[PDB]
Amino acid sequence: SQPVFASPLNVEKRRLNEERALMQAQKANIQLPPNYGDMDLILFPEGSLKNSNNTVIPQSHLKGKSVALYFADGADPKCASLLPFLLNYYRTMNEGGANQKIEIIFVSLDRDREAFESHRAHMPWLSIDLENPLTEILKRHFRVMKEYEVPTYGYGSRTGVPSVIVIGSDGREAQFLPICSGLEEGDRALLRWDWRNTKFA
């Protein structure tokens, strides 16, 4: 139940968690429905994440990483301006060290497959392909949207396209990088990223 109660990711998480909880309830003085601290899920399925050589990787690879979703749209002048600085920041702060620090997972808000591939070819880190329901479920989970077509349930939009949002193991919001937000610093908010306290555990 973080950050949004009305998200498809969290309703699927809840259904799976209390389904399993009811299963060992009848199998076995237990608390129902299970609390969100003990609630658990997999944020990315087996065939979702895709690296620059177009070979699939699963979720457990991101241990010890500072992982952030990049919701982006290729035709947006916002994203066209933001992309080289994200490239620079990822480049220098992952090359300068003995430990691989951050990882970025790309979520597309593009028109179609051709535009998605043309935008993703300029981008080295992980990505989720557009035909996956994972991109659209993450958009509704973290409330990233350019125009109200999909119904948000009397609730907010955290940002417009693009954004980098660092994520936790259970889909929580660790911190918001203020590019297009209440703070409004384009191509400079990336220095607020702290890779220490937000590890994918």
Partner: protein, 48 residues
């Protein structure tokens, strides 16, 4: 002798015929901008 038959039609008899009525059917169809969804995301959940 013949009678010169009275040709004549006054102003009030000549110079207006019933016009077609003006074709008016156009409202102001305004697409409502959707209410921009609100996260001035508050203090308690925001920092702690």
């Amino acid at each position: 002798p013949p009678t010169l038959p009275f040709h004549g039609e006054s102003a009030y008899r000549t110079d207006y015929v019933p016009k077609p009525l003006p074709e008016v059917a156009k409202p102001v169809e305004v697409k409502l901008p959707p209410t921009l969804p609100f996260n001035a995301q508050s203090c308690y959940r925001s920092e702690y």
